[PDB]
Amino acid sequence: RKQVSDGVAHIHASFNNTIVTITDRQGNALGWATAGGSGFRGSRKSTPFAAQVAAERCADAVKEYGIKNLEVMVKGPGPGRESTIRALNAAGFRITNITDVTPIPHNGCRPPKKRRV
Amino acid sequence: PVIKVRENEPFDVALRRFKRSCEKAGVLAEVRRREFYEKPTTERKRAKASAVKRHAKKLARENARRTRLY
Amino acid sequence: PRRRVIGQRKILPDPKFGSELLAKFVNILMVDGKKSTAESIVYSALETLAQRSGKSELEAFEVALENVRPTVEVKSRRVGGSTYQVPVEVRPVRRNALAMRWIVEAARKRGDKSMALRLANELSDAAENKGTAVKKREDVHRMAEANKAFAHYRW
Amino acid sequence: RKFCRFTAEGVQEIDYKDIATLKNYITESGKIVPSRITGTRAKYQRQLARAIKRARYLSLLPYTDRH
RNA sequence: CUUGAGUCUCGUAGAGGGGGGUAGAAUUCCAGGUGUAGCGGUGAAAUGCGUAGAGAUCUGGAGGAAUACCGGUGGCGAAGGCGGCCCCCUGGACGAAGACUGACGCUCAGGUGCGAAAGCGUGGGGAGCAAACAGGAUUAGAUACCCUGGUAGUCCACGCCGUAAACGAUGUCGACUUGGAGGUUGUGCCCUUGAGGCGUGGCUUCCGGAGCUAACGCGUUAAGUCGACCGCCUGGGGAGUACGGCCGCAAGGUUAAAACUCAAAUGAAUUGACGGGGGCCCGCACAAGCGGUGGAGCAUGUGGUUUAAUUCGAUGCAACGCGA
Ligand SMILES: [Mg+2]
Ligand SMILES: [Mg+2]
Ligand SMILES: [Mg+2]
Ligand SMILES: [Mg+2]
Ligand SMILES: [Mg+2]
Ligand SMILES: [Mg+2]
Ligand SMILES: [Mg+2]
Ligand SMILES: [Mg+2]
Ligand SMILES: [Mg+2]
Ligand SMILES: [Mg+2]
Ligand SMILES: [Mg+2]
Ligand SMILES: [Mg+2]
Ligand SMILES: [Mg+2]
Ligand SMILES: [Mg+2]
Ligand SMILES: [Mg+2]
Ligand SMILES: [Mg+2]
Ligand SMILES: [Mg+2]
Ligand SMILES: [Mg+2]
Ligand SMILES: [Mg+2]
Ligand SMILES: [Mg+2]
Ligand SMILES: [Mg+2]
Ligand SMILES: [Mg+2]
Ligand SMILES: [Mg+2]
Ligand SMILES: [Mg+2]
Ligand SMILES: [Mg+2]
Ligand SMILES: [Mg+2]
Ligand SMILES: [Mg+2]
């Protein structure tokens, strides 16, 4: 509805899925798209291509808002830390800032036990 | 790792600058370490093993600087 | 093929139109080393095709090839606990070979009286973009668009 | 190639109040640079790191670049 | 008597110990805003979560636990162990110079104290993690590995327990015996001339000489050469078990046999072979292809059955149109 023209792209890049959320400067979400919701399930979901498709879908989900430039906040170690950024640029956006916001505890909680696979 | 794109900066080189900043900060490696708990006995063993390997290559290099393969 | 680099056997052009492209077609159609009967089928089918659609025989055959020739296929790479179909672009030489084989198999499955009629209808259908041969190209391409996620990353 | 500035200036105790030098031994993200890279002696590195932690408490240097 | 062992003076480094504060990341939870169909998870899934609005994202709040980077075959401690920062209380070590005491030393059965984790008692606390447990998978089964959850416990106080591959699988103390490259921490001297030179202590890592060793290896931090004292071993199993004593709230700990049974058990190294170890390289091995076999009728061989006899032999590949 309203035009903001200055958004922020939040990219949640886990080992299993990629969630792309576009919001304004104050954190209010405008649209989102995920690899799982873009026609990829199981193995195909955790692929850089699937993350890239999700970024493209999130662009059309937000194009009515008339966003010109936006910042990129990348969180997570998984695949799709990169392809989603290129897909956002290829969607016709001005990438102004790129910052990593992965939560890095300073020796906080005890992580789960090692998988014996 | 906060990257700001400069004027007349192509996006591709800005992305490349972002990869380096993350790499020098060791963000990806940190998350790998913290995915599962490592018993203190294990990391002490792992740290010692890495120290031995690091030292072993330093000494092994000298004998390869003294050997004529042919 | 582990180490042996293999060159290429040269094929003689067909006696009538002098085309290396068509000489491969009669080889694929030929069964049990009956080359003479194979080219008779091909030549008569081309004669029917040329009259049925106006274009020169060689040009008409080419048009059918363009409508059947694939550009991407899926190779198979097993993964621990699953099998992955990796999309890979196909070489121009293998492009023609796959198209020629698909037309021949489609013609053999058709219900027409003679093999020449079986063949001639197939290039006619292929030139108009319908039939089993082009349907195979559709299936191969759809399979390779669905697995675009595994391309490059698992090449 | 990298030598210890502290040892070459006879710095005695590194001062948490001297922000100018401390920024030379923290990364862009605020992490403490290892002495392997800066070439500082082990004795001053312990003093240097200790000093940085106090500055961080006093909010003279960031803990992280995000904050 | 002063050379062993101590005391004093001045300094140095240190996650040494106890107590009390505090800070910043992050997880979880609570409330709210934006927002919409998925999230989560796996080898693949499903349980689970979600239109009662999740996940994602932003703001505010609560609480517990642990201290990224520094960080180092770095440091300290008798060992167990000790890692944010600050204060209070406190132990030891080391160095410099001189003074002092004058063998006051070493070891140590019994004894006493300390002693990871788990566990136990009482009272607190409880975010994350996670025995038990529950569900979903996997499977021939799966009381497992994997997934979603999850109680004790992990945290604090005070007691108890006294065990670990509590390991350097190497008791303590002292003396002696070629070297090399480092780490760490003192200190003396020299145009300080420097991001210098020459010494002299403590601790420590990796090589390696003689010597030693069954060998592997150890090698001035000895497993070398010696001295002092202590602990301990005497084939494998039975068995660190039974009984007894002592200790413990309990779990159990400690001390510690015998009958019986065997001709071995074991250590290191060697040659092979093997590996759901690694590396390199091949082969119609796979892949890329074409044509078959397995179904039909018949030919033929074999098994089986049958028969008075169905002669004998060949039996994974490498027997079965084979001896024929
Ligand atoms: Mg998990
Ligand atoms: Mg409901
Ligand atoms: Mg002291
Ligand atoms: Mg006297
Ligand atoms: Mg005793
Ligand atoms: Mg405990
Ligand atoms: Mg308790
Ligand atoms: Mg309680
Ligand atoms: Mg579990
Ligand atoms: Mg179960
Ligand atoms: Mg859990
Ligand atoms: Mg014991
Ligand atoms: Mg231990
Ligand atoms: Mg022992
Ligand atoms: Mg040695
Ligand atoms: Mg015996
Ligand atoms: Mg006996
Ligand atoms: Mg007992
Ligand atoms: Mg007893
Ligand atoms: Mg082998
Ligand atoms: Mg094949
Ligand atoms: Mg048959
Ligand atoms: Mg027979
Ligand atoms: Mg015989
Ligand atoms: Mg026989
Ligand atoms: Mg025989
Ligand atoms: Mg034969």
Chain A hits for B36, Cβ within 8 Å: 111-115
Nucleotide showing the shortest C1' distance to residue D62 CA: E24
Q: Which residues pair with A85 in a beta bridge?
A: none
Residue C95 in any domain: the answer is yes
CA C117 to chain CA centroid, Å, is 18
Our count of domains for chain A comes to 1
What's the CA gap between C46 and C66, in Å, rounded? 16
Taking CA–CA distances from A46, the nearest residue in chain C reads C149
Containing D43, the helix (H) or strand (E) segment is: helix D42-57
For residue A15, give both structure tokens: 């080992």
Helix (H, G, I), strand (E, B) or coil at A74: strand
Residue C91 in any domain: the answer is yes
Chain B hits for A99, Cβ within 8 Å: 1-3
Chain B hits for D66, Cβ within 8 Å: 2
- Output the distance from B12 CA to E77 C1' rounded to whole Å: 55
- Angle at CA C29, nearest 5°, toward C28 and C30? 95
Domain containing residue C59: 20-147
Nucleotide showing the shortest C1' distance to residue B54 CA: E73
- Which residue bears the tokens 């200055």? A6
Specify the amino acid at residue B68: R
Domain containing residue A71: 2-117
Residue C154 in any domain: the answer is no
Which alpha helices (DSSP H) does A10-116 contain, by range?
48-60, 83-90
What's the CA gap between D60 and D22, in Å, rounded? 10
What's the CA gap between A57 and A50, in Å, rounded? 11
Render B11-31 in DSSP notation, one character per residue. Answer: HHHHHHHHHHHHHHHTHHHHH
What's the CA gap between C105 and C136, in Å, rounded? 10
Nearest by Cα to A27 from A55, A8, A6, A3:
A8
Our count of domains for chain C comes to 1
What's the CA gap between B21 and A102, in Å, rounded? 13
All chains having 3 or more CB pairs closer than 8 angstroms to chain A: B, C, D
In this complex, do B2 and D65 lie within 8 Å of one another by their Cβ atoms? yes
CA distances from A56 to A45, B46, C3 (A): 15, 43, 44
The CATH number linked to C51 is 1.10.455.10
Specify the amino acid at residue A116: R
What's the CA gap between B18 and A102, in Å, rounded? 14
Residue C14 in any domain: the answer is no
In this complex, do B4 and A96 lie within 8 Å of one another by their Cβ atoms? yes
In this complex, do C82 and A43 lie within 8 Å of one another by their Cβ atoms? yes
Residue C71 in any domain: the answer is yes
Nucleotide showing the shortest C1' distance to residue D31 CA: E69
Residue B65 in any domain: the answer is no
What's the CA gap between C134 and C116, in Å, rounded? 19
In this complex, do C150 and A44 lie within 8 Å of one another by their Cβ atoms? yes
Ligand 23: distance of its center to the CA of C67 in Å? 63
What approach was used to elucidate this structure? cryo-EM
Ligand 8: distance of its center to the CA of A110 in Å? 22
Q: Do the beta carbons of residue A11 and residue A20 sit within 8 Å?
A: yes
The answer to whether residue D67 neighbours chain A at the CB level (below 8 Å) is no
User: Residues 6 or more apart from A13 whose CB is under 8 A from it?
Assistant: A51, A74, A75, A76, A77, A78, A79, A80, A81, A84
Q: How many CB pairs under 8 A join A and B?
A: 56
- Region of C132 (left: φ > 0; alpha: ψ -120 to 50; beta: rest) is alpha
Q: What is the resolution of this structure in A?
A: 2.3
The answer to whether residue C83 neighbours chain A at the CB level (below 8 Å) is no
Chain D hits for A104, Cβ within 8 Å: 64
Residue C86 in any domain: the answer is yes
- Output the distance from B59 CA to E209 C1' rounded to whole Å: 20
CA distances from D41 to D4, D11, D24 (A): 6, 12, 15
The answer to whether residue B4 neighbours chain D at the CB level (below 8 Å) is no
